[PDB]
Amino acid sequence: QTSAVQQKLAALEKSSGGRLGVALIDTADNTQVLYRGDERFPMCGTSKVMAAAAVLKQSETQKQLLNQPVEIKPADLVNYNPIAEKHVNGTMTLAELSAAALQYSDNTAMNKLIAQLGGPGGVTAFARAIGDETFRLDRTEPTLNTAIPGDPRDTTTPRAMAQTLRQLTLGHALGETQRAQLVTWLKGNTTGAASIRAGLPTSWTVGDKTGSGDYGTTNDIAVIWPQGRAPLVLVTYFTQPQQNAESRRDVLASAARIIAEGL
Ligand SMILES: [K+]
Ligand SMILES: [Ru+3]
């Protein structure tokens, strides 16, 4: 059965010319709204949440892990490295790499997180360990963002990602201290004001992680604390038919606005 909200999301999708995926969990009652909730989308930089969370999980049994230095060499720089480039021929700690990956979307930082986990499959292994059977990370930065239609690499579904983001940020996938650190990092994101945030009432607080890639892929995953309400988790994924398509953060904002108005 197609709800009013799903009908509005379908109308939005029609006029965008791309493919939209949405999953909401309202933790007030544990109910879900889904639009293409079981279709696979390229995660792009939204996958950085899983990598950072996997390192946080490792840190539960190693008190000093987040202070561990990692060498940054000139050859490590990839396509978008606003924090790592300052530390070439130097080091960053795993906390610094996590913060850079999440809050600035530094791709070199993400590669160091992936390497700390033993490669893309180590990120997938963590996903499986916390009950996510859908997520897969197959490649490093920058190629994990190729976002080719039909390609299963580096994809998940909206349903799966919402459930995982809820477990990580509001549930008990991580220890208490670690959960709080993840939430702090997400709430300090610098890249999100044009995406889910832009569709929500001002008073609501958001922590989010964006992503982008080829095929005009434009993504955001968020944990939301509405005014006077239990928290929400919202995934919005969007991808387009041609490789060179422009980003459409406005479509994510429009999806968020529809979800907010349907609560
Ligand atoms: K793009
Ligand atoms: Ru492995």
3-state secondary structure labels for all residues of the chain: CCCHHHHHHHHHHHHHCCEEEEEEEECCCCEEEEECCCCCEECHHHHHHHHHHHHHHHHCCCCCHHHCEEEECHHHCCCCCCCHHHHCCEEEEHHHHHHHHHHHCCHHHHHHHHHHCCCHHHHHHHHHHCCCCCCCCCCCCCHHHCCCCCCCCCEECHHHHHHHHHHHHCCCCCCHHHHHHHHHHHHCCCCCCCCHHHHCCCCCEEEEEEEEECCCEEEEEEEEECCCCCCEEEEEEEECCCCCCCCCHHHHHHHHHHHHHCC
Name the domain count of the chain.
Answer: 1
Q: 247: CA distance to ligand 2 center in Å? A: 34
What is the residue range of 91's domain? 2-263
Ligand 2 center–CA 123 separation, angstroms: 9
Task: Report every protein residue that has its C-beta within 5 angstroms of ion ligand 2.
Answer: 118, 121-122
CATH number at residue 25: 3.40.710.10
- What was the structure determination method? X-ray
Q: What separation in Å is there between the alpha carbon of 211 and the centre of ligand 1?
A: 10
Resolution of this structure in Å: 1.2
